[PDB]
């Protein structure tokens, strides 16, 4: 987030970090329940990659993070790599997340759900703060 | 890339108003937000765009793409969860 603010620890429970086996965070994600994580199809998530929940400070070794293994990657077959449309992939966890004060699920809208322009929302993650 | 989790408030735009910036690259399963002074950037992808509905934080978008320079005047593009929740419900049921 370029021009964002530091979040309050534990305040965005569903936010998870996707990292390869090198430790590198490439994408973010969201826990929709204890065994499923939603991320972007363009992220290119394999099963060599790991889901990390309960994290705030990536450089803090004292944190009680949860390193979750991916069982299967369910890419949306209506995903278009050329237009980058229908950019959503589900990740079935081989090991279920333990929900706590810091690890939990965000709510999913109804297909019928309505979100008007001019409405203020929130985005989170560990992406570049400057370019 | 920051060590700790960041956050940013930003408004939802209309696709029509967003096509003014991105034209025909904006498709039906995409929803824009930004041009407000903040911008999602590389590494934020896959991440959540949440709005409160009935006092509960609900998934409205997935950090997808935008400005190569993460320009805070240019709207970011997120995957429209409203259009993609049917497939998710179908997938979780069957697996």
């Amino acid at each position: 987030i370029v021009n964002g603010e530091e979040a309050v620890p534990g305040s965005w429970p569903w936010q998870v970090s996707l990292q390869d086996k090198t430790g590198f965070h490439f994408c973010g994600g969201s826990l929709i329940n204890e065994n499923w994580v939603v991320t972007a199809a363009h992220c290119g998530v394999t099963t060599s990659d790991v889901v990390v929940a309960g994290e705030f400070d990536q450089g803090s070794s004292s944190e009680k993070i949860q390193k979750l293994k991916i069982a299967k990657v369910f890419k949306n077959s209506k995903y278009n790599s050329l237009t980058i449309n229908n950019d959503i992939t589900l990740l079935k966890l081989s090991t279920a997340a333990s929900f706590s004060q810091t690890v939990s699920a965000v709510c999913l809208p109804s297909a019928s759900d309505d979100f008007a322009a001019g409405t203020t929302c929130v985005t989170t993650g560990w992406g570049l703060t400057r370019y | 890339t920051p060590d700790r989790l960041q956050q940013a408030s930003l408004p939802l735009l209309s696709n029509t108003n967003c096509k003014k910036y991105w034209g025909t690259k904006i498709k039906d399963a995409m929803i824009c937000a930004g041009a407000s002074g903040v911008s999602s950037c590389m590494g934020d992808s896959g991440g959540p765009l949440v709005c409160k509905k009935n006092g509960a934080w609900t998934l409205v978008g997935i950090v997808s793409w935008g400005s190569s320079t993460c320009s805070t005047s240019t709207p970011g593009v997120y995957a429209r969860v409203t259009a993609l929740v049917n497939w998710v419900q179908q997938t979780l049921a069957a697996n």
Partner: peptide, 10 residues
């Protein structure tokens, strides 16, 4: 869902 134990501050 949608209601964190630790509350956000914007």
């Amino acid at each position: 869902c949608g209601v964190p134990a630790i509350q956000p501050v914007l």
